Design a protein around this ligand. Sequence first.
Ligand SMILES: [Fe+3]
Lengths: 224, 117, 104, 23, 156, 43
Amino acid sequence: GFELKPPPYPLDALEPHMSRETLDYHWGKHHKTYVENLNKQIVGTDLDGLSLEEVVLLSYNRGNMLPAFNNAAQAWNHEFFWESIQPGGGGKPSGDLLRLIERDFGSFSDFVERFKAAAASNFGSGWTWLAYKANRLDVANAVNPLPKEEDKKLVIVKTPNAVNPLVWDYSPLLTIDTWEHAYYLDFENRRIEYINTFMEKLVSWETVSTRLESAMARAAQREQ
Amino acid sequence: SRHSGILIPPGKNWIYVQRITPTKKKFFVLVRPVATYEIADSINLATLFPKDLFREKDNIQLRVFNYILYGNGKPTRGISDTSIQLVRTCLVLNWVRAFFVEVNTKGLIRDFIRIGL
Amino acid sequence: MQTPLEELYNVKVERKVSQRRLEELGVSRWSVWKTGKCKLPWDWQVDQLVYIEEGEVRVVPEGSKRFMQFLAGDLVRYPKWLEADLFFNAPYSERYCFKAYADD
Amino acid sequence: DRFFFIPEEVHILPESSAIMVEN
Amino acid sequence: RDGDTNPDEIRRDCGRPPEPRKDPGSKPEEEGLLSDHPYVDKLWQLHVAEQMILDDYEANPEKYKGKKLSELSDDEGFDERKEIEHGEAYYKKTKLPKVILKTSVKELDLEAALIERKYHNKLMMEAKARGEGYKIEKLRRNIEMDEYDSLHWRRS
Amino acid sequence: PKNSEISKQERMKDAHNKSIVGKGNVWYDMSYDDAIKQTIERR
Ligand SMILES: [Fe+3]
């Protein structure tokens, strides 16, 4: 039985980027409903006890999604989204995160413009993700005997509805909720303004860097 | 003991002891190393194929079959100036046509065996 | 027939593509696929952008008695579900970008 | 993964043969 | 019309559905990736042609006197439009099929192959002088096939 | 059926195999990739 945890920041701390009304409705009316529906579904099933990542990967079922996939995936993506935003967010990252962003995108401006374009071009409800390419396919002859250390890079991907990169065995690092419920009470249809405000005020580079290091650790532990 | 033949494993060859009684009241002992011949469980078929970096899944598959030409206890006969083969390792094609492949260059001729599905 | 194969099979051709579009697509940061005189039977179960800088490729769709002539300097987007036959009569090298749904 | 081979020169001769070696 | 020789072109000129076929029943992402580059067969043929030319040169060196190897000429009649001719041959009282793979010398890197062979022969002589044997793991053409297969597997 | 096409092919291969190996018993079978693997470690 999963539970809904509060965001790690006060509901009034995200102004003027995200109004308190939007925050409380998004959290306690969308995420709360998704979590409670998932808990209702998973009563008495095999799903009990497994962690949320295992829940999402089990409910994906290699494409023919089980009925519980929607609620679990939405809950996981909402949990991810809250952890990626802080009042002191925005600016630029540093260190290995910045060297990887430079290697995979040339310059920071190139990366942020590509991310803004992807977030704006996501048609309909969905998410835009930045993830670490540490995927392994469920087929033989999928192993590269001569890795070049570049195949495990950072890529920008867009997903509709509740799809998240972990279904492809990717490691999510940063997300922006392009679902209209995330910003309609604040920005209405002005999605470009919402994306710019998110990127320049809410991006917590510390959490992104920690997730990048966690993905590196997972890749290393999969190496041996 | 009264057993006709007792085999003693080595403590470099297996020691086989057999008792022969020319008469009822006399007997002796014979000691003979036998073969101690171990076959390579694998043959370096990298005089077979170059061991490419990538190999796809194939319906066909090859297996190294260990054979023994002579049965357990069956005698072996060898004619003069001709040896005896005792293993004759074989490869089994399990999953097929076959035709020659001849590459030529300015009259230089060489044929190949092509076994495909 | 009257209709050329490109219109029938929905193949985008951007011959003599300018530098602006090339740098917008990020072609310079794509991988290089090489081939000589060969013949690749392929079915495009996914979209794929292809830029040809050296070499020539003649594309023959499954069953067609005609071909689409692509030279160097052309940007070609092979559509999903296309069942064509790639032909090369010379050393060839191209830059690619496999595209999923939406994206670009 | 182990086989043995005892060397024994076995001869088969007719009853009408002459044997130059004693038992 | 008379120019309509492909049913797919016809059904795409109008709005008609494609010709159906039996469902294979095998999912497309569960199948294994493909890493056999179609150009390797040409690479294999060029490799064996170069090896046989080198072996003939080592067997009979006096022919290649007064002419640069890179300036070799083909026989009068070598056609590039009949590079593959099907045939049949008898072998052990069996008429097994045979395919003749024609090959010129222009498309072969004779100098590199000769230098590589001399590297082996010199090192084989050194190994022979040391009372040892040297076995080559793979040649340059094998590395070329491996890298082309790496490209194809990357594609997959 | 003994006159079936498979039966004709089935007995033909046994004659082809018997002239190669004979009456001996299969010691054991090992995969081709195992032949690639073990002897490289040996050499
Ligand atoms: Fe949401």
